[PDB]
Amino acid sequence: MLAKRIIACLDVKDGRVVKGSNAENLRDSGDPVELGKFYSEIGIDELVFLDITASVEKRKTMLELVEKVAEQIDIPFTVGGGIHDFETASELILRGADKVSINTAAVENPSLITQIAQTFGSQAVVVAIDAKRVDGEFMVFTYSGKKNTGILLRDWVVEVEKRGAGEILLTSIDRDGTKSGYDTEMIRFVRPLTTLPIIASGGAGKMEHFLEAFLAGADAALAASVFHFREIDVRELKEYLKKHGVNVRLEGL
């Protein structure tokens, strides 16, 4: 059966991971190399490096992060945050990013998905879909959740797979950071619409939330807060999930 993955989202500013959380077991929890390597060693399956500024000097600083991270970590990582075009995605993958996450640029140019997939393989292209329920209908939002595109989530999911994406990173904006649970209604809504792996994102607060995301059909669970704020232990989480039938990888724990 398909693997079920636990993925940590590391928010990045100026090539460093947003700090303020005290990893007194680490020398510098702002270092993407040291932090990513640590997560790799404690059982995280993949990383996402999300540039949350996505703007000034982002291009160069993210390239340097990729160069340093790729040579030191042994689990896959995705980069995202303001990847606007094929050349930017290409540079990141060529420097060692395993995957790139595109969102606004994909909505505005869906064949960008296909271009990356054809050059680098579909597995290198993650389409991040940020959605909200708008008057009872799931809609796609771009520009960090500030633009309702008026595109129905249902239609965009189908198009994204048609365009050759390898995975969908499905973020419920309205649960993100709330620690209130993943948007399992959204996950369940998307599940029958695509055969692609769905990375659920936004809302994780406790181990049981991960179980619910997987029961809703997620193939991976992404979380920022619970790892950033050191609220959940990765090994304890995987043991609990495996006990409840979820096909997580316990190797190396």
Numbering used by the authors: 1 to 253
What did the paper state?
To assess whether the mutations have an influence on the conformation of loop1 we determined the structures of the HisF-G20P and HisF-F23A variants by X-ray crystallography. In summary, our crystallography, proteolysis, NMR, and simulation data demonstrate that the HisF-G20P and HisF-F23A variants have opposing effects on the conformation of loop1. However, whereas loop1 primarily samples the open conformation in the HisF-G20P variant, the loop1 population shifts toward the highly flexible detached conformation in the HisF-F23A variant. Whereas the G20P and F23A substitutions decrease the kcat of wt-HisF by several orders of magnitude, the F38A substitution has no effect on the steady-state catalytic parameters. Instead, the G20P and F23A substitutions likely influence turnover via alterations in the closed conformation of loop1. In contrast, in the case of loop1 variants HisF-F23A and HisF-G20P, kobs, increased linearly with increasing concentrations of PrFAR, which is indicative of a simple binding process without involvement of conformational changes. The HisF-G20P and HisF-F23A variants on the other hand interact with the substrate via a one step binding mechanism as loop1 is, in those cases, unable to close properly over the substrate.
